[PDB]
């Protein structure tokens, strides 16, 4: 606040985006119940994958 | 002498003013508004 008389109001910008985006993380990794699944190339490894 | 005492009034009152807050700009009003920003 420079001055009393200039009543700074701050425009909360950063925060606006930061959210924005941590939303979107969050529904593209943490929206399914499991986080990953490994995933083989031939059945002989395939048992152990699960 | 009604003119001579008159110009000395005026000039006495002219020096008043000139001593007045005059050492500024005049523009950029101030922003006494309040303690709300």
């Known amino acids: 606040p420079v001055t009393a008389g200039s009543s700074s109001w701050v425009d909360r910008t950063v925060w606006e985006s930061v959210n924005g985006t941590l939303q979107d993380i969050i529904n593209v990794f943490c929206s399914g119940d499991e986080a990953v699944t490994f995933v083989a190339d031939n059945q002989q490894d395939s048992d152990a994958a699960d | ?37």
């Open chain 2, 1 to 37: 002498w009604s003119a001579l005492g008159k110009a000395i009034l005026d000039e006495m009152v002219e020096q008043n003013k000139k001593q007045e807050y005059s050492g500024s700009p005049i523009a950029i009003p101030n922003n006494m508004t309040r303690l709300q920003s």
